[model samples]
Target chain A: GGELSKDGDLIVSMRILGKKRTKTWHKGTLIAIQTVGPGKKYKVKFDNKGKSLLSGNHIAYDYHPPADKLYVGSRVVAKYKDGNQVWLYAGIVAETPNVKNKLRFLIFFDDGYASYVTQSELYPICRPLKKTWEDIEDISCRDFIEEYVTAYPNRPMVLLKSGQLIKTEWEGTWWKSRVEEVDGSLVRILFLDDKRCEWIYRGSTRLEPMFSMKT
Target chain B: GGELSKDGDLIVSMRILGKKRTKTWHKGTLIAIQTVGPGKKYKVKFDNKGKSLLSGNHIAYDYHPPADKLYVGSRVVAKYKDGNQVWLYAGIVAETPNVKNKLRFLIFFDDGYASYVTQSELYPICRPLKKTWEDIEDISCRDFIEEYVTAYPNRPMVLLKSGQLIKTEWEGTWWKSRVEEVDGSLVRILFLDDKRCEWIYRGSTRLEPMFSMKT
Candidate 1:
């Protein structure tokens, strides 16, 4: 029902990182496939290395020529997955195509490191429109907690009950915040952008959050 | 002419990182100092560890209370230097202040990691105005190369001779580029935004670079 990696396909294998190594891309041929719950892990025999068992997220399918020729020393974005999600960031091509590099371009991510990547993996630099929590359509607290907290079961989260807040000597310019704790009328609220938490009056002095951020 | 690490002052020490460990913050007292070119390195007796030699970039002085109490769940930016520069980013406080942590909050950087950080090292989240190379107000090529390329002596730079370019049978909107070579007008120019490099004309081409990026 979808494009899934199958056996005997040419692919790019990601070098598993450990001490003394940077995660670089390698050309490989899919030798076998293992079906897991939501994704498949492939056994790929890399061109110059031993075989590897890697998930779909760590491999790229058949190579395709980039829409245009990528130049060394030019800024661009590429498929990278060392972090939570494959978030693309600005970077520059660090080297020209070398015969030994197997058509891969060495990319230096703006985050301050380099990796060898294929032509099919590069993308033009871009950014999402500036957004804030206030822009998110309000959702139920249960959904927010369920999504943000449960996914990270490894880390304890701030527990809160719906509450209001009041800032000090402040005129009508209240920033968005999250409710952290409530003890009678003393509520600990975290201001989203300011990143400051203050204990304010709960229901007496009066204030309701106007906006919140997803980040 | 600057603030330097002095003896007998309370400071924050950064944990040196190696395998089987994540760099975290430590409380310490500066016991001695040694001057290096343009900066001074310190010998600090960390509260819980043996005395060691370090530098100003690796330590923060004084313990000033944050403007307000930071809530446990708030988004914040802290002084962190695990990359080319101490670039600040978004993060959430992972835990409330604990007596054992010695007044430092555990920060989970949006980049997907956590560290123990002092309040004095944290800043409110902020952003620079959205800018592009076109908005740099233009500078001489010598200035750009001198400032950007020479400082990074460790990396080889793209050698170039001033040149012009021509994109595909496209329109009038030509992107900016860097000159990589000028083979007597058989020029090779790298498009900055699109990140494409092409062989084109130098003396007879209909383009000159209109913008460039700092990175």
Candidate 2:
């Protein structure tokens, strides 16, 4: 019933984790749609929309559905095969643009570890309502990123969709820091102003102790 | 009613970490025991045991025990406010042998950490009678020591223990290696095992990593 972005369509953008999921998501959370094609291979990326933010780009997804559902973007929740739901959020469905279909759905879970895979194939039918939605406000994305960044407490690195790496720096608070690249690698860095939250990486990108912490 | 050896004898034997305990004690593992004097703190020296078993004289305790419970062969468990407990052996419970009144309780923990504390503050109580009643044998301490020498899959380092610093090793299948002085002062080396466990001395001590390496 909806139309795709005339400009290549904003497909589902997502982040997947192999070890464990850190944060939870809810409806209205911003996400991107990176799809493969009609075969239903898609992945979603959870993003945060705002200035000074680390640019929320981590994603999450579900493995099994209720059998009654056929697509991915109709309010997706992170539930295990045993039905233990953890997070839920709105999503967009699109083909991988020019890429070939491979595996099913994919999500970048912030498990505090650098990612190795970014794309996947899934049969998602539903699409997000871009026109009606404002900015995606997901707390889990920040939590996910923080948890992921803290994985290497001493040497922080972030994973991007295109397999590029970036560094992180919290300018002052959650709404302050900026993420960048390190030594030209796909591993990204994240910083936060953890003075108040103890774990939040919001501070300047000057490689300060706040940005390069181990505790 | 555990009695003492005629004329105040003691068991100065050593112990090793078991596999089950080593894996679970990711925080760190304890092994071996060496009892010194009654209160005159020993210089926690390394390679002095004269057994070539890579032992250290961790003489880093104020050396005192709690009042109320005091006995040469009394038994007790090292109890912490956090509810973590480690029992003490009876044979090695005399005042710093050289120094009077100041007894030395040479404690060897399963996490490979040792502390020769005093008896005035933490008195020796009865040790766990059925020490073997538990699955202590479930994991062979001997095998653990053998495998521990090899990092196998992970990068090893001097295990971080509370209170004092001790030396540890990290080995792997790689041929390139180097010695490291970890925890501000403990010496650890990793090198090609041409003659047993190759040790790269990073500190001023003949007590190399291959000292007692059961290769």
Candidate 3:
């Protein structure tokens, strides 16, 4: 699955919540590329409606299932055609796509609807950690919220580095944990306390910005 | 606090995702109210920049605390200045502001920064249910998601009515529950199984769009 010189090609975009990326990624095509302030920017014509200047992280080569397989009962986000825009809704995988119907998975959205969706139509709630727990230096809660979360609400998801520190609910308590692996809606975390390791569903977890050690 | 002739007054607009409502509610002023296709629609000039037609569900006379108080660890969405627009972010309440000083509650965003926010500056993750378990009716999953979840993604919160049915995590299993009370991050739920009742954090719960009775 390799090709070169994709000057004019189709791509899939997602709802981004980070800084300096296209606010929302819909279907688009690459029209041109140019140099902006610090780095190169991309030119895209979303579904032939209009054009936009974007960065690399905003577009995907094509729709490939973000995960190998969407596990049943995992938390996920999917797109459904709304009024004039496609709104992102949260839901759970009701049924895994059968081997024969691997192209579509059944999803039950939070508002109480279930539908069969194609592989690339949905994304797992889990994402990778930006940094390992040990390597993540501390920043003031004020700075992190102001600079990281609030500063880039449009860049939804993609909120971590390798082995980043996070919070997870185990039994009934929120524990300080470092991300080890993420697959579908499952996140494997290593507890900072006693070095205990376990896997938890993403919904039962919270990102770092949601709380602090002392608070 | 009852006032008349409110058509020419300023109103606080919220992001509404319901059918036939304005997509995003920024700051706005009500210009006129009239009858639309069905009931009635109001015209508004958001921050004196642009205009929109909306219903009574979209605007508030002024910002009021959605709840009595912001709990210490409640889940909330707050607005912060970002890029050329105001973005909504998810965070936790780190500190409560003192009335003697000003109206500012300190918040710790999930991206790791904490800032002082006002009561109206944020919204709790919880809302009332539409119907009790006994009186509520059901719809096909496919219809509910397409009509309710995907259709109103812009509506963001306000996804319920009184006594709505939902799910919450207790111990480790997801249980069928009904909304009895919601204040800040705390939700009092009446469980359908064995009629057990309990209060759980909203983050520890998933909305109706997120799951189903069997799946």
Tell me the tens digit of each residue's lDDT in model 2 across A1-215. 22332213323332231111212332222233222343222232222211111111222332434434533222232322212212232222211122322422322222211111212222122332332112223333334433433442343423233223233332222233233432222223333343111122222222244435533
Quality class of the docking in candidate 1, CAPRI style: incorrect
The TM-score values for the models, in the order shown, are 0.25, 0.21, 0.24
Model 1 misplaced stretches (Cα beyond 4 Å): A1-94, A97-215, B1-68, B126-215
C-alpha RMSD values across all candidates: 20.9, 22.7, 19.9
Model 3 lDDT per residue over A1-215, tens place: 22223324322243221111112234455665565655455666654134566554344443435554555544556676532235455455555655544556766554333456777777553221232111111222122222332333232333333488876654235678788876543455677884765543343214443333223
Q: In terms of DockQ, which candidate is stronger, 1 or 3?
A: 3
Cα deviation of B192 in candidate 3 (Å)?
39
- What lDDT, from 0 to 1, does candidate 1 have? 0.43
Model 2: per-residue Cα lDDT over B76-131, one tens digit each: 33322111223322122222322421334533223232244544434232122223
TM-score of chain A of each: 0.28, 0.22, 0.32
Query: Which stretches in model 3 have alpha-carbon errors above 4 Å?
Result: A1-215, B1-24, B66-118, B122-215
lDDT (tens digit, per residue) of candidate 1 on A86-119: 4343345545566644556766543333466767
- Model 3 per-residue lDDT at B81: 52
Global lDDT of each model?
Answer: 0.43, 0.27, 0.45
Q: CAPRI verdict on model 2?
A: incorrect
Candidate 2 Cα RMSD after full superposition onto the native fold (Å): 22.7
Task: Tell me how each candidate scores on DockQ against the true complex.
Answer: 0.01, 0.01, 0.03
Give the candidate number with the greatest lDDT: 3
